[PDB]
Design a protein around this ligand. Structure first.
Ligand SMILES: O=c1ccn([C@@H]2O[C@H](COP(=O)(O)OP(=O)(O)O[C@H]3O[C@H](CO)[C@@H](O)[C@H](O)[C@H]3O)[C@@H](O)[C@H]2O)c(=O)[nH]1
Ligand SMILES: O=c1ccn([C@@H]2O[C@H](COP(=O)(O)OP(=O)(O)O[C@H]3O[C@H](CO)[C@@H](O)[C@H](O)[C@H]3O)[C@@H](O)[C@H]2O)c(=O)[nH]1
Ligand SMILES: CCCCCCCCO[C@@H]1O[C@H](CO)[C@H](O)C[C@H]1O[C@@H]1O[C@@H](C)[C@@H](O)[C@@H](O)[C@@H]1O
Ligand SMILES: CCCCCCCCO[C@@H]1O[C@H](CO)[C@H](O)C[C@H]1O[C@@H]1O[C@@H](C)[C@@H](O)[C@@H](O)[C@@H]1O
Ligand SMILES: [Mn+2]
Ligand SMILES: [Mn+2]
Lengths: 282, 282
């Protein structure tokens, strides 16, 4: 459930947070609109697990595996079982043009997988997320929407959950805003001028409550349709639109690049204590 | 309104948040349950003002002025007009045994004051807040509950608003938990053992959404009634109970001691960039 009566936490023994000791001094851990930026060392997962289990939280995870990308499902799902929301209720929604190619993956208790068949034609995921509206409202509390050509290597848990989140793109977290690859043509709905922008968010990992995710995906789909009607395609497709949306609708948490990393491309810099969810070649 | 459809922010020009530059390196700016701790330098008030004005947010402020404490109202209210939620809708609720002693204070536009008469007997504020339940639900989005023997000296605005907040007590923000003056007798409902506790919150400044404030004040009133029936009075009265509640129900923001300070007692230490709401002698 979200927003419902919250019962008392039980007694817990854990280290006292100390006001005059910051968790992390090397990174920004809160945005200027007071949204946490989630890095290792900023959260006590035991407190968070208690809070979310007491609400019997169910997390939906959407993933698209169309054409050759069905090959990525086995590693994606098997590593999700090891690292994604373990202990919580999880419902995977696998959208594919080849239901028979979905691997048979053994799931832990309280976890389920639904195969949803779609047509084969990246930019139409927004539309499909916004066919499933009624399904998701009835079945899960939060939605997490990710790319499939990825693997989990470390904990990805309830610390991410919030009404609306985006993830810092691993190539741009140190960049100034004029360097961000936002859509820069005023003719596109995704247009952001050079003096605007907080962050460059990656289209590969966003989420939130079902209501907020439906609002985002609806808005991005509508904006993409407008661009299509006007004969323009944003430079980075759905990611350009996601960036425009999150500029105008500030996320209530921001995930650090721990949550979307490419080790082949970018190595393992000092600012990353954990590499949680990472690109697979292709 | 709270929780309703959020329209898009307009274009804004402001400094880019930089991921590899923390706002503040000298203090903890997020709790281990991912609640912001509100210090100067952590928020862009222009972004927050936009967000809350777009929801037409109304803030209720409750204050009790019983017996000799009516003398504190003039400075309290006049300085609130200068510094508290300026630009937003505000409704003051002044609870007093002497309605005629309430000073005639000139209010800015969009601000109103109601005088509520009560009986003269600190611990019964929880009960009165939890007589007013229907009134507050109909009239305001957030409630802020404060002591009267105080003055505003600097900005106190929408950066504080969240479902549930407490404020760090100015005498104890650097203390280890065993030193906190929690109720330590197991016979009291307010009991917290020496190995538990995040922070020591002051009873003089707490708040949240109307729903969460009613939950807190109801729970504290019920706990205080149990203690009374058992012949025990918590060491710091309502503040002991507030501390127990916020241990078991984590606040979604924590205000730094900028928001409750005593300059006569504690001076102006380096960690405080602003002194916003401060004790008046008596
Ligand atoms: O033939 C395809 C092509 C794409 N996909 C799905 O769409 C996702 C995105 O495509 P992918 O090739 O992974 O794109 P990338 O270049 O790795 O990622 C960029 O492009 C994506 C789509 O615009 C955004 O989500 C990312 O943020 C952006 O970095 C894939 O993971 C799949 O889930 C398929 O299922 N089949
Ligand atoms: O005769 C009185 C006594 C108290 N009050 C009200 O109750 C508040 C609390 O009393 P006060 O004397 O200000 O208590 P303090 O010792 O300054 O504050 C401590 O006691 C309060 C009451 O337990 C808590 O709110 C504070 O966190 C705690 O620091 C006052 O500000 C008034 O609003 C009156 O109106 N008339
Ligand atoms: C060799 C490819 C270099 C890619 C560096 C930048 O990442 C790319 O950024 C684009 C926006 O400017 C868009 O998000 C695609 C993104 O490329 C994807 O993500 C990277 C981190 C790599 O995993 C890359 O292979 C992938 O295509
Ligand atoms: C001289 C008084 C010294 C008070 C220091 C500690 O503050 C007191 O803390 C108590 C809990 O341990 C409780 O909250 C009362 C609080 O005293 C109040 O707040 C202080 C900051 C002073 O303003 C004091 O005058 C006031 O009574
Ligand atoms: Mn990819
Ligand atoms: Mn006082």
């Amino acid at each position: 459930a979200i927003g419902e009566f919250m019962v008392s936490l039980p007694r817990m023994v854990y280290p006292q947070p100390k006001v005059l000791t910051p968790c992390r001094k090397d990174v920004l851990v809160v945005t200027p609109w007071l949204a946490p930026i989630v890095w290792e060392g900023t959260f006590n997962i035991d407190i968070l697990n208690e809070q979310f289990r007491l609400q019997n939280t169910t997390i939906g995870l959407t993933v698209f595996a169309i054409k050759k990308y069905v090959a990525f499902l086995k590693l994606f799902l098997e590593t999700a079982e090891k690292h994604f929301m373990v202990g919580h209720r999880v419902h995977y929604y696998v959208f594919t043009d080849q239901p028979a190619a979905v691997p048979r993956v053994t799931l832990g208790t309280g976890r389920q997988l639904s195969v949803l068949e779609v047509r084969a034609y990246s930019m139409r995921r927004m539309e499909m997320i916004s066919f499933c509206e009624r399904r998701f409202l009835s079945e899960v509390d939060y939605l997490v929407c990710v790319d499939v050509d990825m693997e989990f290597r470390d904990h990805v848990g309830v610390e991410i959950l919030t009404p609306l989140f985006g993830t810092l793109h691993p190539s741009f977290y140190g960049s100034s805003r004029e360097a961000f690859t936002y859509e820069r043509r005023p003719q596109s709905q995704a247009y952001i001028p050079k003096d605007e922008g907080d962050f460059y968010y990656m289209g590969a990992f966003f989420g939130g409550s079902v209501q907020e995710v439906q609002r985002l995906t609806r808005a991005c789909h509508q904006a993409m349709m407008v661009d299509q009607a006007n004969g323009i395609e944003a430079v980075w497709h759905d990611e350009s639109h996601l960036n425009k949306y999150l500029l105008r609708h500030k996320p209530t948490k921001v995930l650090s690049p721990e949550y979307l990393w490419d080790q082949q491309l970018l190595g393992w810099p000092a600012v990353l204590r954990k590499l949680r969810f990472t690109a697979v070649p292709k």
